[PDB]
């Protein structure tokens, strides 16, 4: 399991979690989806 | 695991390559731009230079005018509201004039004249860009293959927007400049002409689109499967055939019973790609002008039960 692979699985799961959280908190699924995608992309693009 | 050569595991960067010059006018050439590590994980991370000749600048200016004209009309449809503009962006449309104007230029600006202006802009831009591709092939002494491959798609585009409206006698037939407006134009075109599925040239165009996907999956997989023998360097495998070319040929020789060469597979590729738009343009041209109901036509020509 490469560093990139672990970062990718973590990005997916953190995207799901923060998307759920901001979908409930933000009043719509779109806000949660956008926040999750943004944070996960910023996480996965950055290496270790 | 076993490496599959889909991403470069190690990147290397060196001097900025400014390219060659056979008959290139160095003056119009730009300077090397930045380097993209993310995009370099898939290919050449270098950006630029960009050649900006006389047909190139003409194309840039005309395309800027076309896109900007569509944008201004979209803002007008928004009530100049940025929030609406970002809400109804897909649903906007710079529609052509309604059929009662026919081919006449005497249409109100709000009633399709602006569409005529933007269409002129895009026409000029695309034709100057075709000239640009031909000239850039000319400067480096290369064949004009990219120019003709572009001319195929240009002909489909001209049929959709210019030639078919002229033949039908109304600008109302042409495609609007909208996101879902042109999707709806496509679906309505099929419904009006009676199941475009039974257009033989629509079927041929789909055959060659499916064939382009099949052929590029096959060629990409083949070249990646022999990239361990330097299969990527296709030009040198043409000039000096290696074990990569022979293994690639023999795979398909033993699979299908026949094979290509390192050069002729690209002849297959270019023809498979250009037949898509060639047959598509023919089929759109015949629709309405010659056949108004493709399913009844199919019935009369086999192709469908009576």
């Amino acid at each position: 399991v490469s560093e990139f692979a672990f970062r990718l699985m973590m990005a997916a799961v953190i995207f799901v979690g923060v998307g759920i959280m901001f979908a409930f908190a933000g009043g719509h699924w779109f806000v949660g989806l956008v926040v999750g995608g943004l944070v996960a992309a910023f996480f996965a693009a950055t290496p270790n | 695991a076993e490496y599959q050569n889909i991403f470069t595991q190690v990147q290397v960067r060196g001097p900025a390559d400014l390219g060659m010059t056979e008959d290139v006018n160095l003056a119009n050439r730009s300077g090397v731009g930045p380097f993209s590590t993310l995009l370099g994980w898939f290919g050449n991370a270098q950006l630029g230079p960009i050649y900006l000749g006389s047909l190139g600048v003409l194309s840039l200016f005309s395309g800027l005018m076309w896109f900007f004209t569509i944008g201004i009309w979209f803002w007008y449809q928004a009530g100049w509201n940025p929030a609406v503009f970002l809400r109804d962006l897909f649903f906007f449309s710079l529609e052509p004039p309604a059929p009662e104007y026919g081919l006449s230029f005497a249409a109100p600006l709000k009633e399709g004249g602006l569409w005529l202006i933007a269409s002129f802009f895009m026409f000029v831009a695309v034709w100057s860009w075709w000239g640009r591709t031909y000239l850039r092939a000319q400067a480096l002494g290369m064949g004009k293959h990219t120019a003709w491959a572009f001319l195929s798609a240009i002909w489909l585009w001209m049929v959709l927007g210019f030639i078919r409206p002229i033949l039908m006698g109304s600008w109302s037939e042409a495609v609007p400049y909208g996101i879902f407006s042109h999707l709806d134009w496509t679906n309505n075109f099929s419904l009006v002409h009676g199941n475009l599925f039974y257009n033989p040239f629509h079927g041929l165009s789909i055959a060659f689109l499916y064939g382009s996907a099949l052929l590029f999956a096959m060629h990409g997989a083949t070249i990646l499967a022999v990239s361990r023998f330097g299969g990527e360097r296709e030009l040198e495998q043409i000039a000096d055939r290696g074990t990569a070319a022979e293994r690639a040929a023999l795979f398909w020789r033993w699979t299908m019973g026949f094979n290509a060469t390192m050069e002729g597979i690209h002849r297959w590729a270019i023809w498979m790609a250009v037949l898509v738009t060639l047959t598509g343009g023919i089929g759109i041209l015949l629709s309405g002008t010659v056949v108004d109901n493709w399913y009844v036509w199919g019935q009369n020509h086999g192709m469908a039960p009576l």
Binding site: - | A27, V57, F61, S62, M65, A106, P108, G113, L116
Partner: protein
């Protein structure tokens, strides 16, 4: 207003001439088309009405 000539020392004459020609042509076509768009200025239809043409 007696010093503009040296722009020809910072601008390639071929590039600027082509840019000017393209710009003037596009602008002229756009204005002629706008005039044709307006029913009060389309000279073909104006002469059609004044001379009683179809």
């Amino acid at each position: 207003m007696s010093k503009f000539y040296k722009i020809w020392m910072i601008f390639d004459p071929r590039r600027v001439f082509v840019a000017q020609g393209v710009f003037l042509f596009l602008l002229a076509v756009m204005i002629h088309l706008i005039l044709l768009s307006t029913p009060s200025y389309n000279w073909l239809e104006i002469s059609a009405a004044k001379y009683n043409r179809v």
